[PDB]
C-alpha cells in the first residue's frame, strides 16, 4: 500500500528571481530529484525509470521541462494580474501523485499551497479552490481553467500515466522497497534515561522500557528521525528517581530481527 509523491517547491523573491526544485518519494524512499540548476530530472535509484522505455521517459521528461519554464512565467504573470492584491516574496508548493491500492485501484491527487496554505487542487476536469481559500483566487482559477490543453494533459497524467508508471516502479524497485535493516540500540541518561535505536528499515518499530516483564507506561517515544543511508532513528525516554535505574531494560522489536528482540539492561 504505497504512496507516490512528486513534491515541488518554488520561491519567487521578486519579479526577476525565482527557483523551482522537486523531489519524488515512493513511500519513504527517494526516487528522483530535479534541482533548479539541472536541465534534466535525476534518478536517485537504479530502478527510477520503472518499466518505461527510454522513448517514453524522454517524452515525459520533455513535457516536464516545458512545464517548469511555463509554470515559472504563469506565476509571474498571475502576480501581475492580481497586483497589488498579492506581491513578492511568494512560495508555491505542489504535492502530486497517487496512492496504489490492491487489485488495479488507485487515487490520484494534485494539491497546491500558497505561502504554506493548501488553497487549490485539480479535481475531475478542472482546477478548483478548496474550503478556506481567499476569494481572489477565483480569477487565477478562471484563467487556468480556460487552458483546455493543460486540463487534458493533467487529466491524462493523473488518471493514466501516474498509476501506470508507479505500477512499474513497484515491480522494478521491489528488492529496495522490501529491504530489512537491523536496529542497533544503546543507552544513556540526563533523572531521564534514553534508549537510542538506529539503523532500522522499514519504519514500523516497537520500543519500551521494562522492569523484567512489566511494561513501564511512562515510556515516551520521540519522532522518527532519518539517517543519511535511508534507515531510521528513534529514541524512547523514561523519567525516573535517581538510584532506581537498576533492574530497568530497554526492549526493541523489529521485523528485521526475525523474533530475536534486542534487550539492553541498565
Amino acid at each position, epitope marked *: 500500500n504505497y504512496t507516490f509523491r512528486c513534491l515541488q517547491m518554488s520561491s519567487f523573491a521578486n519579479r526577476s528571481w525565482s527557483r523551482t526544485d522537486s523531489v519524488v518519494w515512493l513511500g519513504d524512499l527517494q526516487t528522483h530529484r530535479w534541482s533548479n540548476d539541472s536541465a534534466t530530472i535525476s534518478f536517485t535509484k537504479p530502478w527510477s525509470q520503472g518499466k518505461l522505455s527510454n522513448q517514453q521517459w524522454e517524452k515525459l521528461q520533455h513535457m516536464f521541462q516545458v512545464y517548469r519554464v511555463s509554470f515559472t512565467r504563469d506565476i509571474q504573470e498571475l502576480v*501581475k494580474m492580481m497586483s497589488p492584491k498579492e506581491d513578492y516574496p511568494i512560495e508555491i508548493q505542489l504535492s502530486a501523485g497517487c496512492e496504489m491500492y490492491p487489485g488495479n485501484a488507485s487515487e490520484s491527487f494534485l494539491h497546491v499551497a500558497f505561502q504554506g496554505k493548501y488553497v487549490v487542487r485539480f479535481w475531475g476536469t478542472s482546477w478548483q479552490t478548496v474550503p478556506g481559500a481567499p476569494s481572489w483566487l477565483d480569477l487565477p482559477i478562471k*484563467v487556468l481553467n*480556460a487552458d483546455q490543453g493543460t486540463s487534458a494533459t493533467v487529466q491524462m497524467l493523473l488518471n493514466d500515466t501516474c498509476p501506470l508508471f508507479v505500477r512499474g516502479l513497484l515491480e522494478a524497485g521491489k528488492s529496495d522497497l522490501e529491504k530489512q535493516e537491523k536496529p542497533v540500540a544503546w543507552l544513556s541518561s540526563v533523572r531521564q534515561l534514553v534508549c537510542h535505536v538506529s539503523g532500522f528499515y522499514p519504519k514500523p518499530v516497537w520500543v519500551m522500557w521494562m522492569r523484567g516483564d512489566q511494561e513501564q507506561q511512562g515510556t515516551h517515544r520521540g519522532d522518527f528521525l532519518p539517517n543519511a543511508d535511508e534507515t531510521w532513528y528513534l529514541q524512547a525516554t523514561l523519567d525516573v528517581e535517581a538510584g532506581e535505574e537498576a533492574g530497568l531494560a530497554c526492549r526493541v522489536k523489529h521485523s528485521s530481527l526475525g523474533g530475536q528482540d534486542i534487550i539492553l539492561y541498565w
Partner: T-cell receptor
Amino acid sequence: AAVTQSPRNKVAVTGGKVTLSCNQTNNHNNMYWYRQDTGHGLRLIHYSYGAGSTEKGDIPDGYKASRPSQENFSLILELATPSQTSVYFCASGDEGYTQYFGPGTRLLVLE
Amino acid sequence: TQVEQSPQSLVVRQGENCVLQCNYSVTPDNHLRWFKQDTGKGLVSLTVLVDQKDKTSNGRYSATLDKDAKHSTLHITATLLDDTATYICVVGDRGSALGRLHFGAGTQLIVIP
C-alpha cells in the same frame, strides 16, 4: 466583440506629446498594444490586466501606458521621435487566448 | 526570430493555386492563426489550428498544422484579385490569456488579373 482606436491617422512633430487611445465595450479585463513595422511581425509594447494595471511588453521604451478604466487603454508618447513612426494595433481579451484586434492607427513623426 | 514565413513574396496569376509556409521554434505551441491583412487595413482571421496534427478549411483557404515539425501551410485555391494582401502567421504559446503571441513578418501575395 469590437475594439476601436483613435485617432486612426496622425502626423506629429519630434518632441511633441502623442496619445493613442483604444476603446473596448466587451467588458474584457485584458488589453494590449502592439506596433507593426515592415520587415517585422507585430511586437508587444505594453499591456494591462485591468483598470490601474499597466505592464511592460517586449519593446516598452519611449512609451508610457495608461489604463484609467476597463473600457480605455492609452499609449502615451511623451517625447515623440521619428523611430516611433509605425502602425499601432490595440487588442482586447478575456481569460481565453483570443485577442480581438482594433483597426490600427498610422503614426508619422516628422522632424 | 521565433516565427519564419516563406516565401517573402510571390506573384501569381488569377485562378492559380498557391501555398504559403510558416516554420517556428516557439515553445510551447498551443495554436497557430493565419491572418489576412489588406494594404493599409486590419487583421482578418482566416483560420486557427489547435491540434498536434490539424487541418482546417474556410472556403478557398485551407491549412495544416504539424506541431512535431513546427510547420504550418496555408493553401489558397483559385486565387482572386482580392487575395492581394499580406498573409501573417501567429503562434500563441498558451491556451489562455497568460499567453504571448509570436508574429511572423508576413508573406506578400500579388494576384495579376
